[PDB]
Amino acid sequence: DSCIQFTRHASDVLLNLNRLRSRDILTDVVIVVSREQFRAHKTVLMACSGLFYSIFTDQLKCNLSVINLDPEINPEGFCILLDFMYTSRLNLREGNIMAVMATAMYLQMEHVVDTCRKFIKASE
Amino acid sequence: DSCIQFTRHASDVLLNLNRLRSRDILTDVVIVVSREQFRAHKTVLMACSGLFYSIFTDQLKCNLSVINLDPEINPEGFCILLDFMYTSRLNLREGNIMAVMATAMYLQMEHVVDTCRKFIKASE
């Protein structure tokens, strides 16, 4: 086509989606990770995770307001990944890399899994 | 912080949101523009438009499944802007620039209004 493109549009949209998350506006699901609860937008979760994409395209699960993750999932690892989904920034540290990678594999977040594997290979 | 950032994340999220729109997945509102109807995600509309942000943060309007736009709004202009919201690409043409700018002013999409004013000033 003969379209023009606004370079910062996608980033500005995500920044606004994160502002809505911070103020709990139009969040439509709670993700339960053991004793912790995380409110989010189903669409953003689906856009970032192969697991949430499969869950919320399911004709029964699409209507659930609460999703319980596997008990092996670490709440901090999930929190770090939820922040990544809404900001593009990953708080990857020596103390959390194993939990983050395990959570990203479960959530099916291929790019996060890839950088975790690279950071781990560098420290061995 | 000591975060790393995935450059393409915001663009990939928006691409996935547009895929959901194309398959009518988790769309939660219909925007009526005269005889035409456009299905969309309230969160994406709010993230792109000052008008939709004000509408869906209203305690009564946040719960509406149908929003009727002012009858002066052109359905093609709205369609072009809805596509822009979900893709960052604006199909701006000599034949549609006036309708697009008028729709962007009504929707409160400042960057679109700015490029329309610049393209109009160049042709005078």
Binding site: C3, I4, Q5, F6, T7 | L90, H111, T115
Partner: peptide, 4 residues
């Protein structure tokens, strides 16, 4: 704005 750019030509994509």
């Amino acid at each position: 704005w750019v030509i994509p």
